[PDB]
Amino acid sequence: FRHAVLLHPSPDGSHVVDAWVTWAWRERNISPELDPYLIYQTSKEGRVYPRPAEAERAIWRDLDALLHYGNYRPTILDNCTPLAQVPQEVLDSLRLRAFGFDQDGQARDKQWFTATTPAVLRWLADRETDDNENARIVRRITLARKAAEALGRRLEKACKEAWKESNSGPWVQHGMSRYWAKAEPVFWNIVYDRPAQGYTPGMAGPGNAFNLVALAAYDEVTGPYCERPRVAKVVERHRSTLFS
DNA sequence: CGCGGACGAAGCCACCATGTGGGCTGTCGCCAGGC
């Protein structure tokens, strides 16, 4: 470990009284091979780093554990969860859990959250017990998740690009907060097939349901600043990208 | 000369979607006759 701890005991051993947190190494070493658990990302210059936790995705409880219904995927999951592996039925009832600690890479810290996948999503598939309405449920759910995330990144980059341009960002924080808060019930309406705006029950896919929520959150955030024509032109150039 | 305050030292990671509404008020013609 990069950190070295020593805990001074209480005489009974019931508690710790003092603690020493200090370095064990002066020279850092590259740890060989990427960590299976984390989700990685490559960025211009080609450097590979783990995707940071975001407390905005924790606003919608348990969104990361929906990772199973899926581009880039953690290797441990991609070895043990799929069908090349070896178990027979086990894979049907496995369910994913994630521990995320969103914080600064320095000493500031913001939020942590656990996230087990809901057992309702797979159990709603077995209530029926048919090959087709079930594969269609699973297809819908996987489809819903894909739409919500693609427009989550589209909306992050939208707000981020617009904020930088408008001043020649704080818009991203409220953008994502509003996004997942509004995008959470529309997802659960798409799964149950209940009627959600931007969606028609029984449609083959998400149906633009998600693209509408992103536009409403974005327009909710950039709303007071689309007044001046110069800034309004920038904001419009970047909301247009969320039109899909 | 001593004490207190301020500053510094890092580790730092990127082609096309939108519909709604309903709750607050007062008036004569006057006089006389009959029941």
Side-chain angles (χ1 to χ4, degrees), chain A residues 1-80 82-85 87-141 143-192 194-244:
Chain A
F1 299 98
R2 307 211 282 270
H3 259 263
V5 188
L6 180 58
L7 54 86
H8 187 263
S10 60
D12 185 28
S14 308
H15 302 298
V16 177
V17 180
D18 287 335
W20 292 275
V21 189
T22 313
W23 66 270
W25 297 92
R26 298 300 306 281
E27 314 170 342
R28 188 64 280 271
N29 197 338
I30 181 105
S31 178
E33 295 93 12
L34 295 291
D35 197 333
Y37 294 109
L38 311 176
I39 300 186
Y40 284 130
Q41 276 182 346
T42 65
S43 75
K44 298 191 291 183
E45 186 183 16
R47 59 173 199 262
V48 181
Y49 68 97
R51 192 175 80 234
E54 293 187 352
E56 64 262 20
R57 302 173 59 88
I59 206 104
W60 159 357
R61 248 280 229 300
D62 67 53
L63 171 76
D64 301 329
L66 295 194
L67 195 305
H68 234 334
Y69 290 95
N71 198 341
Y72 191 73
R73 296 175 190 183
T75 81
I76 177 172
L77 63 89
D78 269 349
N79 284 323
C80 316
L83 277 299
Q85 216 244 96
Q88 70 290 348
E89 185 267 343
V90 164
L91 306 181
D92 300 330
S93 190
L94 75 84
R95 61 175 185 174
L96 183 57
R97 179 178 54 195
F99 299 115
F101 184 67
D102 181 12
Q103 57 181 340
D104 196 349
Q106 305 277 114
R108 296 185 182 89
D109 303 329
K110 182 166 64 177
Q111 190 64 285
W112 63 43
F113 52 97
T114 69
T116 77
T117 196
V120 300
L121 290 199
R122 70 67 183 280
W123 176 83
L124 288 173
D126 308 326
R127 216 115 102 318
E128 34 145 43
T129 62
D130 298 334
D131 205 339
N132 53 334
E133 181 175 347
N134 176 20
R136 288 184 62 180
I137 287 184
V138 164
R139 209 36 202 288
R140 307 240 307 280
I141 294 192
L143 283 240
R145 165 199 204 270
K146 290 225 121 105
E149 302 215 316
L151 295 75
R153 295 185 300 270
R154 42 183 328 130
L155 187 54
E156 70 101 10
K157 202 191 74 78
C159 288
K160 161 182 155 75
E161 284 229 278
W163 186 95
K164 99 177 47 162
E165 249 200 90
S166 289
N167 292 341
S168 64
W171 287 1
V172 180
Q173 181 177 0
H174 302 287
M176 290 305 127
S177 183
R178 337 223 64 187
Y179 177 64
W180 298 115
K182 294 176 180 297
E184 158 85 336
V186 69
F187 175 85
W188 289 115
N189 288 338
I190 289 181
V191 63
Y192 278 62
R194 286 200 261 185
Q197 205 159 50
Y199 178 61
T200 163
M203 180 133 163
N208 263 60
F210 292 106
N211 191 307
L212 253 61
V213 179
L215 287 175
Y218 179 86
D219 287 342
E220 301 265 26
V221 172
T222 195
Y225 306 123
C226 204
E227 285 309 323
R228 251 171 325 169
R230 161 206 76 126
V231 187
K233 176 179 286 184
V234 172
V235 165
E236 291 300 334
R237 168 162 34 235
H238 294 293
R239 68 181 293 274
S240 68
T241 194
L242 278 65
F243 279 150
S244 179

